[PDB]
Design a protein around this ligand. Structure first.
Ligand SMILES: Nc1ncnc2c1ncn2[C@@H]1O[C@H](COP(=O)(O)OP(=O)(O)O)[C@@H](O)[C@H]1O
Ligand SMILES: Nc1ncnc2c1ncn2[C@@H]1O[C@H](COP(=O)(O)OP(=O)(O)O)[C@@H](O)[C@H]1O
Ligand SMILES: Nc1ncnc2c1ncn2[C@@H]1O[C@H](COP(=O)(O)OP(=O)(O)O)[C@@H](O)[C@H]1O
Ligand SMILES: Nc1ncnc2c1ncn2[C@@H]1O[C@H](COP(=O)(O)OP(=O)(O)O)[C@@H](O)[C@H]1O
Lengths: 386, 407, 391, 409
């Protein structure tokens, strides 16, 4: 949840020309160009029986590029980011873990009629009424206190697209048409979502196969009828080197299916022994899968792009930073991981609020740097003890 | 239901009553039974604020520091700071993979013991200031805003009161439907400089002696599970029904996992998945190694054994070492908590002993030293007693050196 | 199809004092009072392990008495009327047929949760929007729709238009004057069989069966859950088995099993046979019933019909058929109902009505009655003459 | 395990407590809820003796008599005389060949319900005479030879005490290991002419209130079968019962299996019953019939007394049942009225007696309820001749009903 929710596309303009800062992506022009090539290959449908593996040192946006590609494929294309170690789990075998990971990426866009209570707000009427105008007619559509509060939460009074007995949305003041836009919302429900639906402390105190078969049959029926629309998404497996030979064989088998989503893997080792067997191979992947792999390498980050990334992140976390603070954070992110730099921000915000300030200073940044250790420092300091 | 808590494990940190940091954010030298470790103390305060802000979205805390630097003490202090009755479940990873049972089940129960339930129920209790304690059918006068009430009790209830050390001028409540006397404290009429309002000198009860008090029972899920003895799931459904009714407010606790470097990668994945949920308690790790090899991989080496996936979502809090002064202060505090009178020179020798081996060794040396002093007819412990105890019982490092030296 | 559609209770009241006409039921006072005794027995619950058997010649009201009893017990008490030969089907065995009959006689008044957002419509607000609704509590303009506002506009606006969950709109009075968004315990007597049919997977099923046992098990567990919760109050209905002598000895033992349960509905049986062969055995027993069941039987005898009573009953039926006929036509029908069965008289009624319309009349005359009497015969005449051809 | 018995079937014969015959052997006119039937009564006491002598080797009893002459009642009295808790499982032969189940299985459960198990277990119960009943944690004073004990009980147990109607000065036992209060009776200190020793005025408990009493639990084999629930488990349940007996706490007590309407039983069923009674553990099977020499069911050609095949009849001790005259009819109906609680005038009983002669004693007995209920509506506490006459005019009987229908035919 959360993480890098600021990229809505690769940002490579057209004809595979990344326009630097755009929809999040603010670097990795080579990797962006390769990702765009891969995306339009997927669109034209000649990526069948292939996969993409993104190599690069930690903190170079390997997951960001995959998220951007998933967004660029479609506004509602499923994205599933798992880790290699995520499969050796106590409840499920690697078979079940990888099956769930795959079905998490196979999205079904199924239409669903709904009476969105919408209308171009001409007057913001306060529980009470609210004047709304559409091509159908104009009338004072009634809303609750919280519905009008959310209307004021969105830009007033552009819009608003108030779904039936639900929240609103800012458009302009101009959503028009019918006051009852009986629009069949195309809900993108992944196969795994339907499976879990058919099957609140459950995690504190796996689905047989019949539920799976019923889900498959029903989804296929809906898609054939024209109600649903099976749209394969993107499956991202970070730490691919952690996977063993047995899971690699299952991945190879699953890539053979027609419903298989685009498979993206990320690795940062090179020439590592395959977890199974005792044979060294690049990125610890059996050559049978490496042969048909489109490899993309993410270059390390430079100071200006790091500072831009931090600017975006603070914009996301509602934190104002001093320019000296931004430079110190940039130098930290160069000396340490970007992730640690991002972690620093939230702690600095509370440190600033402790002294009842409005904008974080360099002093808060240094105080939080002294407070929470990062990966490299903690180890160095521990081994020296031993 | 009997409380299922490893009293012995947390008994060594009974002096810890909180994090002991001021409102500004910085921590005082000594407060709430916590000495030193200012940096880690402030970090723990920040983590407490994050937890109370519900900004711990799928994150955990890793406490890194050498043995005997209060990692468990800091975790207990965090648990106390989130609430006096907030559950705290310490556990060392070396006992997940027991010969029997199953790693999943062991981690499952450990997680359960960390999730509490604030069951507030309105029961008419006898909350009144004891004016007199006549034990004959034990008509004890309970003076309140209504007045003294010669409520006839039972010999069992009188024995329960005696177990609660209830005397005259003691504002106590005696839950009438269960006949259990629980010492709330004394009256505010005898409040002095230390005795204050709403504590062990609780003020006079306002209202009738028989008042429907909203008594809150602190109980975690695991206690219910052991009480009802699948079965585990059924207990969950009843708890959900209770919360839905509007009397069970869930309170996530703290799960302290020591010796994390010796945990299976499968256990790490299970912990990650458990902490993914919103109802999950805060998972606080603790380690002493450096970049030790992951357990079930044999070739990937990652900081503190934690796999990179989890460790990317972790807030590392470093714990420092104690100088002779802090060691002596902590030893004296533990002795006071144990009721041990010790000389300052003995405390100094104990501090230098702890510096060589560990704080654990120095703290453990107290009890045998006090017994030896008692045998010789002395009420206090002198430097000679500590010398003799150190010469009698050894520490792992020194004994291992002795064995290897001969080799 | 539409017979006994006017028997709304036993219509005696007055401390078991049957009135001649009451609510539709006219005549057979003797058996009516006996039915009243049984009705109080059901309320007091001293009928467990007992059954009622109505003996009498065909067409004397034995089925009508059963319909009145269910109505008298409650406006929504389930009623199941089956025939003895209905159990001999090739699809289902005697067990399945009888099991189904008992199920549909077991009614459950599931107090379905309905969040009734009603309120006198102050202004018909178009439309997906809202609607100005006002009650005694407050005026809370509420959420609405187009197909729904189309119904509201198609209805009497504004006449209250009580809205339940945005499905119904009662245009009675300006009466939705309680809480705007209130709650209702909607009475719903879903028969145990009805729950079974919902679970069963399967519009031509009747042309191109048998409920699975596991399906029975699940809803039985469900019914217990709601019953303990307090939503479902199991209401013991009335099961009427016409032509009881048709049932064989094996089925009779099954009835004994089903009548010894707390869910067992009051069993009412009817037969017009004296001492006959017990089906499935080589003995002779009264009413063709085994002695074990006959011992604990509340047997009520329906007296044959009198002249004036038949005429009165006809008067009631024609009002249901919207047929106006002359008094002489009335008497001839009464005479027909006397020499032949009352059912045959009713059959003539509708046929004679089309006779009247054939000559473009409004009131059926005696001429029409004879015209249909010669056209369609009665079972006695058809059998009588038709055996005459044989010899 | 919940007892599985048709309380309704035996409910009509609750007034009977035993055979009511004297030590000499003769039977008195009225005793233990039995009026008349002297020849039959004195006979039944005999079979109880052969049962107690273990000389009922491969034999059974056939009770022949008209309908409504106490064939079921006499069978019930036989069980009572052999023991108050001795199991009694009545059954009508017409319910063996039901649409479902199997004749073997149907005859199965019938036999099982006829076998009891006297499981005596020493459990420390709270046997004492109630001195005070303060319900506050329900500390009830239980005075015994040791003295009064203010034993802390639970409200759930207190409700059980109220369900047993326990008042002051009652010697009762309260199972401490089960938390169940059982009303043994009152104390002998208040015993009067009717209250006697070791009865509902049981004497003062001798010993500590918490005394380990070897309590007997009366449970049949079928009860366990139903509690442990497909089939084939039946064998294991039999295994456990055998083990319990071997240990030495469950004394097997054969009961009485009553088979009414035996004339309508298949020949194959007869053979099974014959083989069952061959075993020593088998309970006494008592038949009942009202026909004469009706042809055997499964042969269609061979006619034998009461349908029973000649083989079985050769080993049967047939007990005849007499008819009741007006006097006995009136007496018996009056006893039934008292057991349920109706005040009825003698003239009303006399009319009821003549009703019984025409149809049955069954029909007269069933008429009591509606007649008393009718009198209640009219505000009258006692039933008069008018009520009986009116009820007879409302509800009919099989014989008259059939005659009316045939007469119209
Ligand atoms: N092109 C990019 N534009 C903006 N932010 C980025 C970009 N690439 C990475 N980031 C952000 O930088 C941080 C570190 O990069 P991350 O994707 O976690 O690295 P990696 O996947 O290589 O380990 C994350 O917060 C991520 O969202
Ligand atoms: N910061 C502290 N303040 C007060 N007492 C402490 C502190 N740290 C440690 N102690 C005491 O020293 C002890 C030993 O610590 P230990 O259990 O070794 O911590 P850990 O093993 O988790 O690092 C405890 O018994 C505790 O009472
Ligand atoms: N009390 C009554 N009041 C009015 N109509 C009656 C009454 N009793 C009987 N009927 C008429 O007689 C018919 C009764 O059906 P009936 O022949 O008794 O059913 P069954 O098949 O059991 O004999 C109905 O059509 C009804 O209109
Ligand atoms: N000897 C008796 N003494 C008292 N009451 C009796 C006696 N015999 C029969 N009865 C009563 O008469 C009844 C009807 O008899 P019934 O059950 O028909 O016997 P059977 O088994 O012979 O048919 C019972 O309800 C019973 O209470």
């Amino acid at each position: 949840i959360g993480a890098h929710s600021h990229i809505r596309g690769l940002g490579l303009d057209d004809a595979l020309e990344p326009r630097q800062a755009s929809q999040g992506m603010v670097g990795q022009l080579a990797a962006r160009r390769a990702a765009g090539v891969v995306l339009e290959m997927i669109r034209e449908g000649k990526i069948a029986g292939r996969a993409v593996l993104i190599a690069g040192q930690p903190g170079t946006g390997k997951t960001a590029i995959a998220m951007g590609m998933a967004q660029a494929l479609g506004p509602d294309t499923p994205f599933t980011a798992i880790a290699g170690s995520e499969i050796f789990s106590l409840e499920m075998s690697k078979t079940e873990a990888l099956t769930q990971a795959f079905r998490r990426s196979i999205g079904v866009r199924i239409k669903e009629e709904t009476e969105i209570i919408e209308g171009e707000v001409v007057e913001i009427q306060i529980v009470g009424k609210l004047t709304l105008k559409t091509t159908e007619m104009e009338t004072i559509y009634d809303l609750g206190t919280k519905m009008i509060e959310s209307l004021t939460k969105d830009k007033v009074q552009a819009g608003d697209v108030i779904t039936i007995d639900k929240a609103t949305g800012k458009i302009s003041k101009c959503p028009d048409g019918e006051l009852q836009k009986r629009k069949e919302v195309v809900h993108t429900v992944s196969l795994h979502e339907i499976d879990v639906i058919n099957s609140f402390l459950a995690l504190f105190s796996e689905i047989k196969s019949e539920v799976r078969e019923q889900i498959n049959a029903k989804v296929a029926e809906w898609r054939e009828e024209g109600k649903a629309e099976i749209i394969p998404g993107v499956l991202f497996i970070d730490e691919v080197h952690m996977l063993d030979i047995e899971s690699f064989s299952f991945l190879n088998r699953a890539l053979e299916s027609d419903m298989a989503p685009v498979l993206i893997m990320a690795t940062n080792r090179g020439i590592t022994r395959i977890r199974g067997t005792s044979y060294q191979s690049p990125h610890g992947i059996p050559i049978d899968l490496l042969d048909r792999l489109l490899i993309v390498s993410t270059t390390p980050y430079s100071e200006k792009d790091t500072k831009q990334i931090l600017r975006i992140r603070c914009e996301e976390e509602d934190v104002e930073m001093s320019e000296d603070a931004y430079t110190v954070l940039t130098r930290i992110g160069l000396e340490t991981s970007l992730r640690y730099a991002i972690q620093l921000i939230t702690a600095a915000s509370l440190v600033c609020r402790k002294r009842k300030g409005t904008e974080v200073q360099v002093d808060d940044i240094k105080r939080v740097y002294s407070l929470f250790l990062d990966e490299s420092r903690s180890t160095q300091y521990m081994k020296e003890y031993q | 239901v009997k409380s299922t808590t490893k009293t012995q494990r947390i008994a060594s940190h009974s002096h810890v009553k909180g994090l002991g940091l001021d409102e500004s954010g910085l921590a005082k030298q000594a407060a709430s039974g916590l000495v030193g470790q200012e940096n880690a103390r402030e970090a723990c305060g920040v983590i407490v604020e994050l937890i109370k802000s519900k900004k711990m979205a799928g994150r955990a805390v890793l406490l890194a520091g050498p043995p005997g630097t209060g990692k468990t003490a800091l975790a207990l202090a965090i648990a106390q700071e989130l609430g006096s009755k907030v559950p705290f479940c310490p556990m060392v990873g070396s006992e997940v993979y027991s010969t029997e049972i199953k790693k999943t089940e062991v981690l499952m129960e450990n997680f359960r013991r960390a999730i509490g339930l604030r069951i507030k129920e309105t029961k008419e209790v006898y909350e009144g200031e004891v004016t007199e304690l006549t034990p004959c059918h034990v008509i004890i006068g309970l003076k309140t805003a209504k007045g003294t009430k010669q409520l006839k009790l039972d010999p069992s209830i009188f024995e329960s009161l005696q177990k609660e050390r209830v005397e005259a001028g003691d504002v106590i409540y005696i839950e009438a439907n269960s006949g259990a006397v629980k010492r709330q404290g004394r009256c505010d009429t005898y409040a002095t400089e230390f005795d204050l309002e709403a504590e062990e000198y609780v003020p006079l009860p306002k209202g009738d002696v028989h008042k429907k008090k909203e008594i809150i029972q602190d109980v975690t899920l695991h206690d219910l599970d052991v009480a009802n003895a699948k079965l585990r799931g059924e207990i969950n459904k009843v708890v959900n029904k209770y919360i839905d009714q509007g009397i069970a407010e869930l309170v996530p606790g703290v799960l302290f996992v020591d010796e994390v470097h010796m945990l299976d990668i499968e256990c790490f994945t299970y912990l990650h998945r458990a902490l993914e949920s919103s109802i999950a308690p805060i998972v606080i790790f603790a380690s002493n190694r450096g970049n030790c090899v992951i357990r079930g991989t044999e070739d990937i080496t990652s900081p503190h054994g934690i796999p990179l996936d989890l460790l990317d979502r972790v807030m590392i809090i470093r714990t420092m070492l104690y100088t002779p002064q802090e060691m002596k202060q902590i030893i004296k505090i533990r002795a006071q908590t144990e009721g041990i009178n010790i000389s300052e020179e003995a405390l100094n020798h104990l501090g230098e002993i702890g510096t060589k081996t560990t704080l654990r060794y120095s703290v453990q040396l107290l009890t045998p030293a006090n017994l030896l002093a008692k045998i010789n007819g002395k009420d206090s412990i002198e430097k000679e007693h500590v010398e003799e105890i150190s010469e009698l019982f050894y520490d792992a490092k020194s004994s291992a050196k002795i064995l290897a030296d001969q080799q």
